[PDB]
Design a protein around this ligand. Structure first.
Ligand SMILES: [Zn+2]
Lengths: 55, 99, 121
RNA sequence: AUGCCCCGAAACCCCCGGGCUACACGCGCGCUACAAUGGGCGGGACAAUGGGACCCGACCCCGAAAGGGGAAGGGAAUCCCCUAAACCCGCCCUCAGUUCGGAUCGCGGGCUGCAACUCGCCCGCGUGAAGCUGGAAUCCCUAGUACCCGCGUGUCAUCAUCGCGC
RNA sequence: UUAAUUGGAUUCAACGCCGGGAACCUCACCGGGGGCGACGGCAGGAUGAAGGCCAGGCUGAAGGUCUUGCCGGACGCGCCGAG
């Protein structure tokens, strides 16, 4: 039983090369300024990250 | 000559640093170019509110504003030591270059 | 009529090199050949060359649906994967320049039945 | 995130290949059109919002186009994306399934990507399918709004008939 | 319809929605291949335990397993609990 298996192969592009640092998701990743945050995480987080809803 | 660029997310801290630099220049007696307010950088991110697909689509626009000021001074020993002795609050970023 | 590709005989294609064959091939095949073969394609090509030499009597099977047929593999039977089984394909001289996966369909022809209860309003 | 239930060497974890892209048919929201309140050809004008490091790339050479080689500058009020379209002038077409309409296939040339057949986008030539204004019914809109016209960005190695904005 | 064509949502408030423009990945579906039981106990074990390999067979390709031997020197999924 070798360990060569069970390992994610290197990936440089596609949906499999980006994950939410806080959630680990694979879908709606925000890369606007290198946030690398999922949509839901960013929504729940914006007020305290310095972002504001002025209007 | 020395060009200093100071940027922050807080206008009050921005103005505090600018006023400190102005006071240093005035006390040293060196002519100073007024603080140039560069255009504010507004990072806007629009996100869907719902975590699911059901319901009418609603969005929220989260905006982060960064304010920038520029100053130009003529290099001097005491003036530059005093400037390097600036408070530079946590939320303010300062860059100094020579020309 | 005798088979001819771009005015060349099968023996001429045999004697030709990879670069000239890529030149004769369409743009997509030429670009693929210029960029080179994947390791799986290289292994398949080695196996096919051994079979042509006659030292590999076992049936040839592979998952290389992206392999591009070459004149050197004309006249052999290659079993190409399609999802369930390795469908056999007899490489005729005229398949040259086409992908290996174009002759191993993955889906099944559909014979539609009567519409269901929710088909209409 | 989490209670209960369940698999627990399988429902756990990785590798190739296929599918989510199938297609007698019903429906929603849209794009293109059914032409003169126009199509084609040459010429003349005018923006804004935003983005840029394995990134944007001016500028020169090569090519008929797609595109290919070198490469200044720019971590940005300094460089670039970026000399928009609708619009205006001059010529052809003159009410015709047509110089309208651009589906559908053939051949050939490229780009991204480890990989382009299932199942990508672009380009030259060739053909030219319904459609000649639409029943019942039904939708949005009170001022720089509605309608028309294009562009930025999110998704991105490539791909925008989409969302959010200009 | 198929092997699958993975699922959620059905009046306003489902159907360019799940930011869902899916070649690989995403992936949850389908055919096949391989691989983990922390921590306590039961046997075999240092005159031999996990684990690794040069050549080749099986294989779509793979010391994944197998013929050829050789490194490794302390462990133990072949079983009971738990994870
Ligand atoms: Zn997240």
């Amino acid at each position: 039983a070798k360990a060569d298996y069970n390992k994610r192969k290197p990936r440089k592009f596609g949906k499999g090369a980006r994950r939410c640092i806080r959630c680990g998701q694979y879908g709606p990743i925000i890369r606007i300024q290198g946030l690398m945050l999922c949509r839901h995480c960013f929504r729940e987080v914006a007020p305290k990250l310095g972002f504001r809803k002025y209007e | 000559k020395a060009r200093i660029k100071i940027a922050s997310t807080n206008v009050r801290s921005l103005d505090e640093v600018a006023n400190q630099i102005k006071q240093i220049a005035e006390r040293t007696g060196v002519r100073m170019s007024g603080p140039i307010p560069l255009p504010t950088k507004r990072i806007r991110i629009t996100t869907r509110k719902s975590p699911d697909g059901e319901g009418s689509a609603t969005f929220d626009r989260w905006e982060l504003r960064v304010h920038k000021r520029l100053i130009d001074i003529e290099a001097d020993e005491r003036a530059m030591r005093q400037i390097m002795r600036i408070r530079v609050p946590e939320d303010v970023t300062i860059e100094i270059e020579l020309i | 009529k005798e088979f001819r590709y771009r005015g060349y005989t099968l023996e001429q294609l045999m004697n030709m090199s990879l670069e000239e064959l890529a030149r004769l091939f369409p743009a997509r095949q030429r670009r693929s050949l210029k960029r080179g073969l994947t390791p799986e394609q290289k292994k398949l090509l080695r196996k096919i060359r051994l079979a042509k030499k006659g030292k590999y009597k076992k049936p040839i099977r592979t998952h290389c649906r992206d392999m591009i047929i070459l004149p050197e593999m004309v006249g052999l039977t290659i079993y190409v994967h399609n999802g369930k089984e390795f469908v056999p394909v007899e490489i005729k001289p005229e398949m040259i320049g086409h992908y290996l996966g174009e002759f191993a369909p993955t889906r099944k022809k559909v014979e539609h039945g009567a519409p269901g209860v929710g088909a209409t309003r």
